[PDB]
Amino acid sequence: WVIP
Amino acid sequence: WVIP
Amino acid sequence: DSCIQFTRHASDVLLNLNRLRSRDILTDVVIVVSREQFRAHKTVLMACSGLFYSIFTDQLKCNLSVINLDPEINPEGFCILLDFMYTSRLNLREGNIMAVMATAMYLQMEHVVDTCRKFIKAS
Amino acid sequence: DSCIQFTRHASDVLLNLNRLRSRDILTDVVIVVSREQFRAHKTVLMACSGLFYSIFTDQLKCNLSVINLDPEINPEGFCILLDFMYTSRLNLREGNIMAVMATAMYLQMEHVVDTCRKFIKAS
Ligand SMILES: CN(C)c1ncc(Cl)c(Nc2ccc3c(c2)CC(=O)N3)n1
Ligand SMILES: CN(C)c1ncc(Cl)c(Nc2ccc3c(c2)CC(=O)N3)n1
Ligand SMILES: [Cl-]
Ligand SMILES: [Cl-]
Numbered sequence: 384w385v386i387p
Numbered sequence: 388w389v390i391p
Numbered sequence: 392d393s394c395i396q397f398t399r400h401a402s403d404v405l406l407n408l409n410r411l412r413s414r415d416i417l418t419d420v421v422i423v424v425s426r427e428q429f430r431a432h433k434t435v436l437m438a439c440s441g442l443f444y445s446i447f448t449d450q451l452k453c454n455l456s457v458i459n460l461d462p463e464i465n466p467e468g469f470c471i472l473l474d475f476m477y478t479s480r481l482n483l484r485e486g487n488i489m490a491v492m493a494t495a496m497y498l499q500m501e502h503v504v505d506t507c508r509k510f511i512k513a514s
Numbered sequence: 515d516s517c518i519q520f521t522r523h524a525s526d527v528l529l530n531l532n533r534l535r536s537r538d539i540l541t542d543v544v545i546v547v548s549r550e551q552f553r554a555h556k557t558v559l560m561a562c563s564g565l566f567y568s569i570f571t572d573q574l575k576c577n578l579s580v581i582n583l584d585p586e587i588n589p590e591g592f593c594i595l596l597d598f599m600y601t602s603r604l605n606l607r608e609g610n611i612m613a614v615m616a617t618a619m620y621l622q623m624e625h626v627v628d629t630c631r632k633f634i635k636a637s
Contacts, residue, residue, distance in 0.1 A: 384481075384502075384506050384518045384519065384520055384521075385518070385519050385521055386518065386519075387480065387517065387518075387519040388395045388396065388397055388398075388604075388625075388629050389395070389396050389398055390395065390396075391394065391395075391396040391603065392603070392605060393605070393607070394603040394604055394605050394606075395603075395604050395606055395629065396602050396603050396604070397598075397602050397604070397625055397626075397629075398602075400528075400598075400602035400625075401524035401525045401527070401528040401602055402524045403561075404524070404527075404528055404558070404561045404562060404599075405523075405524040405527055405528075405561075407560065407561035407562075407567075408557060408561050411557060411560065411561070416560075416570075416571065417556055417557050417560070417570065417576070432557055433540055434531060434534060434540050434555055434557060434558075435527070435557075437530065437534065437539075437540070438526075438527045438528075438530035438531050438534070439527060439530075444530075447539075447540065448539065453540070475520075475523075476527075479519050479520050479521075479523035479524055480515070480517040480518075480519050481517055481518050481519070481520070482515060482516070482517050483517075483518055484516070502520055502523075503520075506518065506520075
């Protein structure tokens, strides 16, 4: 999971 | 396009 | 094999499937969550959820145009998860994280359950 | 928004859609190319091809279970492109590049046409  |  | 690969292909496919959903094109099922109704594509639901995968591989349920979820399921939690299915983006907030995790456990969306558990553990 | 994103989600969705294709699950169309028949999901075909997008948004053609391609279309070129649609992988070879480019131009798959033009220019 990432900060888009 | 890439070499997978 | 000796294949070449187009990096953005999967993302572009999902973006177009979400465009079809937004315009209600070739949607083939309505998911009923309490009073709320959500139109979707069975194939996308199966690709994202262990629960929908089981439902639509069933020789009788595969032909249903309406699926009613357990009355304990929260419509907002389902909406956030349906959006994630079609975008890879999860709107996880303090006020919705418990309903999102419970819905993801019911829908059998392992990666969402994992990030909810981690975010709850941090707080 | 304040969304988080699961990097592998789009790829995982496409992998599952290809698994459904391989098992012939919820396929809703057969594409006829000369003597050869290819089963697929209309939504995936639309998401990958400007030609299928136009066909299945048509108020009459949207309901057809069989689509016959132009007799000039090569079945192998179509097969390679259908595989690319469901995997992001293109089996581009010296012996098939002309048939693949011609099929991609007909199907309106701009990124495939672009890599074929570049590979031909190099040789
Ligand atoms: C497991 N399998 C062969 C498969 N093939 C096709 C599809 Cl559409 C599918 N989808 C599915 C099944 C289980 C789970 C998911 C999708 C997401 C998840 O967390 N569990 N799973
Ligand atoms: C253009 N548009 C709004 C849109 N919405 C939904 C879908 Cl499924 C779609 N697909 C499509 C259209 C044109 C092209 C492609 C897909 C691939 C391409 O090279 N051209 N295009
Ligand atoms: Cl997930
Ligand atoms: Cl393309």
